[PDB]
Ligand binder design. Structure first.
Ligand SMILES: *[C@@H]1O[C@H](CO)[C@@H](O)[C@H](O)[C@H]1NC(C)=O
Ligand SMILES: *[C@@H]1O[C@H](CO)[C@@H](O)[C@H](O)[C@H]1NC(C)=O
Ligand SMILES: N[C@@]1(C(=O)O)CC[C@@H](C(=O)O)C1
Ligand SMILES: N[C@@]1(C(=O)O)CC[C@@H](C(=O)O)C1
Lengths: 518, 520
């Protein structure tokens, strides 16, 4: 029953998957170090900054009510009830920053709209959230997967991978994510060997069952993944067991997380993953590294985070061993800023800027929460916020690389992705940016380290022998058979054989015919 | 300080929502007691639970409890209350399902909240067609029909008396706005034009209605005004009409229904109005129960006193600093109480839930009649689809079984569409509503018993009638308006729309129906 409650003139609720999904009967599991703790700290950071900022909400201190979602929508929903009971000890909520997993953002949105409470997700990408008739109070600083799906399809179409398999996560993130991909797939002439899908609470066996079915399509050596972070971890693990190997092409669900591949590094080597395009918030690196169990008491999950990151123990852990070195610290050698921090910070500032514009508008005489703002009009706020356009929280250099935060009519953000390749070059395994997708694909093929040192081949049927075989398309448009030709025929084209005619015989290379002597 | 509610423990508990109180004005949330659609409907539920808890063939071995809350006729308030039902599934009583939502707005909002936790809900009065959408309201069902039909009934009454130029005024929201839209679509099909489409909204004050009465008056030919408004809104509109003593022939939906309270203090302005209401047959046993209630025996209903003191203009020692203590011999009876039109639906609703829980308990608990472990934590989704497939004969309180007195649900979870038409009369000095027809699948009403306003069957058409002597009827672009073209002194009317030359030798009759020969 942990939570962060900091009082303020106005309070923002937050939701982060601080903990991984609990297995079996338990609701919460291990600490989600990067996407959980880091993202949570980034919001605390943003709030701190805004509270030192004399040009943004001066005179109005922002407070927070942050809750753990334990990576489960139902859990996130019961937690959220805490935000609405408020509008009746309980803190009034101006708006809610949060929802990492699309499934929780969606469910929380269904609840928050009933009380007209604006919500901004810093990571949920499901296309469903764009539906403003169902999620009329939801915005996000990231784009919908309508685009990430295109980026993936075009990557495949580029390297001519026409026969690929797909495994997706049950839910609003994976299923709609994959569906979008499959549609983009047909359009680019790409067939799906097998469409696998893992679901809720699935145990090892469900995944082992998928690795097999994937292996039952040997020609399909490229497997497209649209799965939850946790699910992706399980699939790569199930592939390690039976030492199965494919070329993975996964969505941001997997992203650039090194934790997903830990303990199976060789099985995911040479994988291509996508992640939202962003640039680290330097000032945040300073803030985070300065954090330790001695100075960070406002984060009730920090000690568990600490003990797990360093394999610690103090006097606040389970009945184990190995006390912890008091000189331990989060620094440049054991920490790398999470890919979406920028979006978390921008989401909090978006809400901040929105409240500020509203405060200047309804409270023209002071910098304080006058009476007209005593009870916020959530509906209005959402459309004083949708029209928001501002330069990325100071923490972003320049202003030319369109570092402006604003929203669609749907409330979404700009669709920019970076393509990564899992490498290991220097003994260690890391993610290298090998391209990106702005509106069209773009990647320097040379820097990509493929699995088995060779640019993968993923086609339904084998290439034809030159010397004679012709390409023959059966009923579909991805599979074909190779029919050798009569020694007197030549290949008028890849698909057709033709008699060279009397007096003539085909050329050694079969491209044409030549006269016969005697 | 004191937010009232009814909490009776049981093996299984049903939540309930009723507009016990009227919408509070201005800053206050709850206002006056809604005697009929409030207290009566509340007591009808307690009545139903009581019967069910004495019934050894229904839920024997399982005692139903209740958690009833006031909606104060406001969706937002209802919503805050409903939170009580879900916090439970985490002092707090576990909710098996919720009986409730009078106003379509509260049902819709509550339905939005309740599906998040798979809690089945049955409304005994909300008629908004939106509720039929099982993709937004997948845990909502209702023992009444969708207004898709009530609108047709209304259009067909107009098309019957040939009222082609009518004005409409709807209440903002999912009840009034979708209701009228439906009507206007049924209007076009039956060639009926709409003079002016007015619409009152949330928190509107006197001036918003007066502004409407005026705009209605600026369409004098349109003497028939179609209403699709909230009960309270209807009260305001008729009050705004009484002020400027304006008078129209009102055709209102069940929002107005057959409530006498809506017309009180303006009886003459609404005389001869036609209103619809869901077709029902009083529940006799309920009459007995309700009349037997008094401030001495009925302590479980925390709103009863206020009800009492207001129905009788009372006082005891539990009222405001007023006067006139009350006669301890007062009592609800045949002379001061009439069963609210929809009570039968409240009872059928509470029973539909019971029957559902009952069939489920027999299925998952094959050994006893008690809530076995399998039902310790109800699967709401399953309940909703053990419930949709429910078909039973109206709680004993309904005679026969031939007039299809079976309660069941559409694939959408709606009930059957049957309405009764009412005429506001006063014949015996007193103003009351008289059933002057009904709509099953086709209209049907004995026009003879209808007491119109200004003793003449209203006329509601776009243009003024033509002068006999010469004018011919001429239809421009539409089929509602027309111009009157007088005819040449040598032409007669071969018919209401055509003028013709009498031809040489002949001349039109004074009458203009024929031609006569010319002398000289
Ligand atoms: C197939 O893909 C290769 C690798 O990029 C490319 O060079 C070639 O032009 C492609 N051919 C087709 C089928 O368009
Ligand atoms: C409606 O108009 C038709 C056509 O003029 C007429 O025959 C019918 O009697 C009218 N109905 C009534 C009762 O007004
Ligand atoms: N885009 C994510 C989602 O919508 O669920 C997939 C990974 C999530 C994350 O960044 O943690 C966000
Ligand atoms: N059918 C109603 C509605 O949907 O609002 C109109 C009148 C209401 C009532 O009877 O209380 C119910």
């Amino acid at each position: 029953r942990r939570e962060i409650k900091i009082e303020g003139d106005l309070v923002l609720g937050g939701l982060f998957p601080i903990n991984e999904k609990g297995t079996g009967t338990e609701e919460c599991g291990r600490i989600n170090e990067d996407r959980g703790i880091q993202r949570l700290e980034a919001m605390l950071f943003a709030i701190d900054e805004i509270n030192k900022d004399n040009y943004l909400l001066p005179g109005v201190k922002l407070g927070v009510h942050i809750l753990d979602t334990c990576s489960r929508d139902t859990y996130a929903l019961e937690q959220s009830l805490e935000f609405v009971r408020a509008s009746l000890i309980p803190l009034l909520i101006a708006g809610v920053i949060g929802g990492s997993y699309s499934s929780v953002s969606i469910q929380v949105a269904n609840l928050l709209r009933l009380f007209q409470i604006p919500q901004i997700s810093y990571a949920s990408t499901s296309a469903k959230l764009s539906d403003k008739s169902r999620y009329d109070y939801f915005a996000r600083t990231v784009p919908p997967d309508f685009y990430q799906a295109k980026a993936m399809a075009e990557i495949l179409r580029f390297f001519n991978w026409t026969y690929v398999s797909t495994v997706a996560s049950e839910g609003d993130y994976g299923e709609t994510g994959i569906e979008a991909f499959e549609q983009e797939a047909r359009l680019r002439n790409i067939c799906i060997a097998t469409a696998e899908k893992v679901g809720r609470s699935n145990i090892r066996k469900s995944y082992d069952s998928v690795i097999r079915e994937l292996l039952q399509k040997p020609n399909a050596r490229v497997v497209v993944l649209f799965m939850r972070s946790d699910d992706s971890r399980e699939l790569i693990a199930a592939a390690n067991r039976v030492n199965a190997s494919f070329t993975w092409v996964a969505s941001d669900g997997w992203g650039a997380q090194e934790s997903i591949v830990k303990g199976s590094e060789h099985v995911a080597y040479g994988a291509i993953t996508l992640e939202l395009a962003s640039h680290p918030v330097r000032q945040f690196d300073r803030y985070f590294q300065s954090l330790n169990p001695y100075n960070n008491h406002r984060n009730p999950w920090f000690r568990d985070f600490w003990e797990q990151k360093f394999q610690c123990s103090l006097q606040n852990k389970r009945n184990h061993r190995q006390v912890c070195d008091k000189h331990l610290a989060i620094d440049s050698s054991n920490y790398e800023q999470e890919s979406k921090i920028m979006f978390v910070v921008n989401a909090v500032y978006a809400m901040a800027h929105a409240l500020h514009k509203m405060q200047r508008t309804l409270c023209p005489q002071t910098t304080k929460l006058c009476d007209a703002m005593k009870i916020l009009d959530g509906k209005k706020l959402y459309k004083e916020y949708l029209l928001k356009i501002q330069f990325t929280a100071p923490f972003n250099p320049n202003k030319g690389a369109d570092s402006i935060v604003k929203f669609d009519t749907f409330g979404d953000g700009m669709g920019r992705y970076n393509v990564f390749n899992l490498q290991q070059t220097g003994g260690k395994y890391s993610y290298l940016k090998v391209g990106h997708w702005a509106e069209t694909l773009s990647l320097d093929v040379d820097s990509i380290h493929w699995s088995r040192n060779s640019v993968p081949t993923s086609q339904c049927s084998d290439p034809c022998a030159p010397n004679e075989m012709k390409n023959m398309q059966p009923g579909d448009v991805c599979c074909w058979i190779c029919i050798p030709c009569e020694p007197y025929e030549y290949l008028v084209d890849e698909f057709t054989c033709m008699d060279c005619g009397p007096g003539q015989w085909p050329t050694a290379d079969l491209s044409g015919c030549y006269n016969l002597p005697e």
